[PDB]
Symmetry: C2
Subunit: 243 residues, 2 copies
């Protein structure tokens, strides 16, 4: 059976690097995309020797239009790429009043605009072939505006909604769209634990995978509450409490 090549963003460290290591050991060829080329080459050299798979290393600053369009083109034309890992370690630096226009641009671009454009690059080809996987790395911060990471959490709420919408749109076409929601990473989770758990959901083709969530029912309750709100949407007139 064909094991498809996986393109992974932010593949130089953290979740991206661990995803590259796991897929290489599984037998997948890789396309590693990251701004930090030095760490990518170190990791790629080790994975080539250990796993004998093919690894192409692309240096790219996805806040650049030039670099992002080049990665988009690779996803569109490389028919061997059947897996896209939308990963970005880009977080928010402190409070909202400390953000400047430039850091907001980069934060939204890396966590929202770039993942959406990459999914659009493979969506048309995945629909042609009737197969493919899009794994979007969100965060549980998208559920918690109380944590004080306002812009970052907002981009993660974006990524979750994007995954839910892409599933309903691309699912019937044979495309698997997964949302992975790591914890804010006071002992936190090991990155090996996190990615191994995310892959257990990937193999089950789970749509929303939240490794740090103790009660899986909590998600379904939130989804039910969401759909329960939409059942009371009557667009003809405003509610009486506003009259």
């Amino acid at each position: 059976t064909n094991l498809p090549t996986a393109l992974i963003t932010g593949a130089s460290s953290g979740i991206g690097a661990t995803y590259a290591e796991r897929f290489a050991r599984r037998g997948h060829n890789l396309v590693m995309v990251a701004r930090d080329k030095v760490r990518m080459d170190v990791l790629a050299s080790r994975l080539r020797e250990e796993t004998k798979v093919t690894i192409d290393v692309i240096q790219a600053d996805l806040t650049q239009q030039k670099d992002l369009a080049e990665v988009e083109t690779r996803l569109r034309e490389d028919t061997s790429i059947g897996i896209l890992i939308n990963n970005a370690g880009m977080g928010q630096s402190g409070a909202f009043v400390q953000q400047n226009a430039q850091s907001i641009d980069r934060l939204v671009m890396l966590n929202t605009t770039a993942p959406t454009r990459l999914a659009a690059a493979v969506a048309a080809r995945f629909a042609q072939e009737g197969k493919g996987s899009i794994v979007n790395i969100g965060s549980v911060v998208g559920f918690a505006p109380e944590l004080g990471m306002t812009i970052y959490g907002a981009t993660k709420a974006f990524v979750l909604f994007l995954s839910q919408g892409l599933n309903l749109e691309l699912g019937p076409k044979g495309i698997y769209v997964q949302a992975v929601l790591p914890a804010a990473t006071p002992e936190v989770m090991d990155v090996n634990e996190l990615v191994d758990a995310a892959l257990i959901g990937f193999d089950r083709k789970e749509l929303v995978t939240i490794p740090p969530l103790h009660v899986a029912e909590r998600w379904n309750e939130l989804d039910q509450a969401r759909q329960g709100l939409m059942s009371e949407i009557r667009q003809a007139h405003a509610a009486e409490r506003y009259l």
Copy 2:
């Protein structure tokens, strides 16, 4: 002084124009920001005659870095502006496979990056003065990925989270942050929607959803959200993942 000036984006038609009309009749001076200068000038000329308030008209394509930076600068330096209406009529054209990189750029910029940057322009000054209002125009589509407007609804889910986070961050400093969520075949009158949103604005309501028939549904949804975070145990993966 007295009634603070309100800056309104997308003020050329729809919700933005209706907001401009309501605030002008209330006695607020306006700063109207929109790409369509012709419709802004028609509306501004009439509102000047009817309401005698001051209206400054700024033509701005908020997908341009130059134009957006100018509106940010005006928000930082004009101390009379005490109200920001983050409004954008920008929607999505059909399905996701039909979206191109350029339309995605503009959709996210107008509905996500620009409102966030405009709020950042007033946040520091509003905290200085200890007062001010930020009204973010979201949508109920942010609750419904089933409607097939994936990117648009995603930007609106962004806007809702931004409002909730800005409330908890800027609220204690005296800043009011409101999220207004209009609906997406009989639709609602735009006058009803803005009149309903302003009823919540005067109550300083944090989340105003005019088309929501049962207000409790929102509180239940927010409770369900917090219930999920209460079961987040970050030390180890859940047992269901080995």
